[PDB]
Amino acid sequence: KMDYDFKVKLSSERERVEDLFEYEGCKVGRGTYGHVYKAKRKDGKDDKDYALKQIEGTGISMSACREIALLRELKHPNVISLQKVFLSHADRKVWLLFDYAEHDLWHIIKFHRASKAQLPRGMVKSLLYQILDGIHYLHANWVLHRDLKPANILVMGEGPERGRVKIADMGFARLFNSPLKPTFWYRAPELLLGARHYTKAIDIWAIGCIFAELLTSEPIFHCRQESNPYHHDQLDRIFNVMGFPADKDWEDIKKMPEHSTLMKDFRRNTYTNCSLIKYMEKHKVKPDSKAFHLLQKLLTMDPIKRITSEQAMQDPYFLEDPLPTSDVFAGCQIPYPKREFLTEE
Amino acid sequence: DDKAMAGNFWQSSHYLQWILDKQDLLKERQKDLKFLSEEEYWKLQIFFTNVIQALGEHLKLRQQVIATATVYFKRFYARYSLKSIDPVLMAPTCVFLASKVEEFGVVSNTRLIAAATSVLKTRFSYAFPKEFPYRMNHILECEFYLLELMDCCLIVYHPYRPLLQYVQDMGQEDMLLPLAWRIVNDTYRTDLCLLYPPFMIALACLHVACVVQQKDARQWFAELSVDMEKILEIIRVILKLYEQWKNFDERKEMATILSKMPKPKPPP
Numbered sequence: 118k119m120d121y122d123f124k125v126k127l128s129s130e131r132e133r134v135e136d137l138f139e140y141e142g143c144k145v146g147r148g149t150y151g152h153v154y155k156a157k158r159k160d161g162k163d164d165k166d167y168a169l170k171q172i173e174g175t176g177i178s179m180s181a182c183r184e185i186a187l188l189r190e191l192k193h194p195n196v197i198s199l200q201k202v203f204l205s206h207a208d209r210k211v212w213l214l215f216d217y218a219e220h221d222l223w224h225i226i227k228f229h230r231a232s233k234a235q236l237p238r239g240m241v242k243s244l245l246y247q248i249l250d251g252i253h254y255l256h257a258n259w260v261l262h263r264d265l266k267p268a269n270i271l272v273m274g275e276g277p278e279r280g281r282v283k284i285a286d287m288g289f290a291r292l293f294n295s296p297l298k299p300t301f302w303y304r305a306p307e308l309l310l311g312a313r314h315y316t317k318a319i320d321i322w323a324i325g326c327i328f329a330e331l332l333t334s335e336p337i338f339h340c341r342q343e344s345n346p347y348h349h350d351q352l353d354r355i356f357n358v359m360g361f362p363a364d365k366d367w368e369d370i371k372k373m374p375e376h377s378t379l380m381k382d383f384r385r386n387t388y389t390n391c392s393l394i395k396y397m398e399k400h401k402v403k404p405d406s407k408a409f410h411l412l413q414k415l416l417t418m419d420p421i422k423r424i425t426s427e428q429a430m431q432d433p434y435f436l437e438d439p440l441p442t443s444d445v446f447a448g449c450q451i452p453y454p455k456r457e458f459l460t461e462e
Numbered sequence: 463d464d465k466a467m468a469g470n471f472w473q474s475s476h477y478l479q480w481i482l483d484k485q486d487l488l489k490e491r492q493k494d495l496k497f498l499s500e501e502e503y504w505k506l507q508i509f510f511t512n513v514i515q516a517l518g519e520h521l522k523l524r525q526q527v528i529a530t531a532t533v534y535f536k537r538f539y540a541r542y543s544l545k546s547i548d549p550v551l552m553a554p555t556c557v558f559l560a561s562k563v564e565e566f567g568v569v570s571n572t573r574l575i576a577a578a579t580s581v582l583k584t585r586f587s588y589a590f591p592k593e594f595p596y597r598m599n600h601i602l603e604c605e606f607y608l609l610e611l612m613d614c615c616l617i618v619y620h621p622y623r624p625l626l627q628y629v630q631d632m633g634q635e636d637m638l639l640p641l642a643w644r645i646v647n648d649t650y651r652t653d654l655c656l657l658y659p660p661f662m663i664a665l666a667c668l669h670v671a672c673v674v675q676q677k678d679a680r681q682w683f684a685e686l687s688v689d690m691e692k693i694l695e696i697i698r699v700i701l702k703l704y705e706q707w708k709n710f711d712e713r714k715e716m717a718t719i720l721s722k723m724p725k726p727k728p729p730p
């Protein structure tokens with residue numbers, strides 16, 4: 118029950134997504150979040166590419182609500198910026214508008230890994246610095262990402278933000294801030310051992326993974342795919358890479374819900390010649406490089422011994438030649454393919 | 463405590479969009495003052511503040527969520543007339559939407575409707591003869607209008623957090639916080655949250671608390687770098703509220719005041 122006059126006035130003024138934007142057949146992303154389309158202004162002669170995100174489901178869900186709530190406030194060059202929200206009353210769907218990011222780390226790393234059949238000198242370093250910059254901004258505002266991975270580290274293509282990182286797809290809604298309420302390559306060991314709550318350190322672990330993957334073109338904790346947080350093979354892979362933590366390395370590990378399960382399954386001696394140093398040496402990364410020492414500080418087993426994003430940004434790595442650049446491509450021609458559209462039914 | 467965006471107020475949508483000018487607010491209010499006196503309008507606002515509080519308590523929501531839902535309500539009608547959407551419908555919608563901005567638990571549809579139905583009959587039958595007449599699909603519809611018309615501004619700052627820091631700073635938590643907290647609660651029966659940054663409201667509430675309890679805090683207040691004139695304005699509004707409260711009998715008056723409200727026009 119509304120005022121009729123009020124209703125038809127709002128109906129008349131209402132910006133409708135299908136009136137303003139052309140996006141028919143221009144789907145570039147599908148997933149649990151919903152659908153993402155490459156869109157162009159039908160009217161205002163923008164010639165500017167946009168990303169239109171139709172959120173999964175109808176009405177405004179806790180997920181939708183919190184995403185809008187936080188994006189409505191967050192403003193940082195390295196965090197994807199919400200341009201507009203459209204609410205379509207007929208079908209009760211929610212549409213979010215963003216500037217369009219041609220590239221992302223999943224596709225960039227994939228492109229390199231295929232080429233086995235980082236070219237600008239400071240690209241890796243530039244990418245990492247900007248990722249850290251963006252996450253630090255979130256963390257300083259007490260916002261966790263909670264789902265960091267190469268696929269939602271976007272990078273802008275040609276245009277006024279050429280080569281700028283955009284962190285996207287923040288895990289804005291998690292019941293009781295818990296991982297236990299509904300791959301694991303980027304998940305911190307405390308998660309795998311039953312941590313009850315997302316934390317800043319858990320995001321930092323994921324950044325470490327991403328950094329290693331940028332250096333090697335391979336996911337450092339690669340593992341087979343598919344409610345319980347314990348995942349044996351993923352822990353096995355981590356220990357095969359990192360080694361098995363000593364008591365002094367992670368004193369509080371005894372406080373993890375799955376610690377006894379870990380003990381039941383794993384013998385320290387199984388991993389005695391395993392270390393990040395040996396792992397990175399096999400992938401042609403010098404252990405005495407500033408790069409490696411910073412990587413080691415992100416990939417610390419014990420979350421409380423893990424470096425913070427701000428401390429990482431101050432690392433002398435970023436003072437060493439070549440310096441981080443605002444454009445991660447550093448003027449160079451972008452060799453990466455543009456996104457292909459999805460015509461699947 | 464949901465500390466998201468906690469240090470960001472000066473760059474927040476709250477500050478940049480929803481701290482209004484007192485005159486613009488008063489001018490927009492005129493259309494509804496064709497039907498109601500200024501006093502009756504205030505009494506209505508107090509009334510629905512109390513309704514929202516009751517709904518929130520019934521749903522076991524923390525005070526912060528209730529305060530957020532209260533501000534949504536105030537913001538909506540600061541801009542649009544009482545006749546645009548039934549406030550009986552708007553109030554539970556505000557509670558519902560506010561509760562979704564938090565991620566520690568969810569209000570199901572049945573629990574929201576059941577709560578609206580039950581609270582109105584058991585606590586507010588003096589204002590309402592009939593049972594709650596809206597179904598969940600009305601709430602959902604209203605929710606879309608509410609979000610749209612608040613320009614999707616969902617993060618709201620409240621006086622509770624700065625108040626906590628101030629009484630801690632004073633080292634007078636035991637003596638002052640219960641009373642000051644309660645006075646913060648009372649300020650939501652006024653327009654203060656649309657006009658002042660919440661820390662200023664915290665300071666005004668702490669001041670009144672200090673006065674009520676004959677606690678001298680002049681030196682502490684002096685050591686602050688704030689516009690004390692503004693704080694005094696806020697204090698005066700608080701003192702005025704208590705006099706209205708004394709002279710207001712909402713149980714005896716609200717049926718009459720509600721009948722005077724402009725009502726939503728139906729379609730032809």
Ligand SMILES: CNC(=O)c1cc2c(Oc3ccc(I)cc3)cncc2s1
Nearest residue numbers: 145146150153168217218221268285286
């Ligand atoms: C949940 N996804 C999102 O929120 C966004 C996806 C994109 C996008 O398209 C992409 C398509 C596929 C991938 I993998 C990554 C980005 C291009 N520009 C901006 C955004 S914002």
